[PDB]
Amino acid sequence: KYICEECGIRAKKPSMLKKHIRTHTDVRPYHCTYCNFSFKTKGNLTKHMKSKAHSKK
Ligand SMILES: [Zn+2]
Ligand SMILES: [Zn+2]
């Protein structure tokens, strides 16, 4: 079985899920330069910065 009971991600492969499930931990080095939230990938980062939240670049 490989379906996150939280998000519902579908990853028939372990490495894919095994990693996903481990993300619900604290393995997110990508921390926003303002909030206290973080992500496991740099992609989501840009997604959180592109928003008009707080990025007076
Ligand atoms: Zn999940
Ligand atoms: Zn932020």
Swiss-Prot record:
Zinc finger spans (C2H2-type) are: 2-24, 30-54
Describe what upregulates or represses it: By mitogens and phorbol ester.
* Highest taxon of source: Eukaryota
> Tell me, how does this one assemble?
Interacts with UTP4.
What does the domain comment read? Contains two sets of 2 zinc-fingers, which are widely separated and recognize the same DNA sequence. There is a fifth zinc-finger in-between.
What this protein is reported to do is described as: This protein specifically binds to the DNA sequence 5'-GGGACTTTCC-3' which is found in the enhancer elements of numerous viral promoters such as those of SV40, CMV, or HIV-1. In addition, related sequences are found in the enhancer elements of a number of cellular promoters, including those of the class I MHC, interleukin-2 receptor, and interferon-beta genes. It may act in T-cell activation. Involved in activating HIV-1 gene expression.
**Protein name, UniProt field:** Zinc finger protein 40
Coverage span on the entire protein: 2087 to 2143 of 2718
